[PDB]
Amino acid sequence: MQIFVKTLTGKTITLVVEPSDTIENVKAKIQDKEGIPPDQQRLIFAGKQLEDGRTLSDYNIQKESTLHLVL
Ligand SMILES: [Zn+2]
Ligand SMILES: [Zn+2]
Ligand SMILES: [Zn+2]
Ligand SMILES: [Zn+2]
Ligand SMILES: [Zn+2]
Numbered sequence: 001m002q003i004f005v006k007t008l009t010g011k012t013i014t015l016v017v018e019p020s021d022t023i024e025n026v027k028a029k030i031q032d033k034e035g036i037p038p039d040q041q042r043l044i045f046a047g048k049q050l051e052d053g054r055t056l057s058d059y060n061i062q063k064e065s066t067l068h069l070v071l
Contacts, residue, residue, distance in 0.1 A: 005067045018056075022054065023054060023055070042071070044067065
C-alpha cells in the first residue's frame, strides 16, 4: 500500500503505509522526508480535513490515493 502526498510546492512524496496508519503516523513520515514539522502540516483528502488520530481506512484512503498538504 502506498499513497502520495503533495506539498505546498507541488512536490510529490511517496509513502508506504498500511490502512490502520493514523494521520499522525503519516505526518511523522512527511517530517522525515521533507523536514516539515507535524504541527505545521494540514492534510486534505477528497476535500476532507484529516485529523491526526484517525486512520487512512477511516477516510477511505486507498492505495494510490493522493493527499495534499495545505494552508
Ligand atoms: Zn501494496
Ligand atoms: Zn502493521
Ligand atoms: Zn504504520
Ligand atoms: Zn512546532
Ligand atoms: Zn489534487
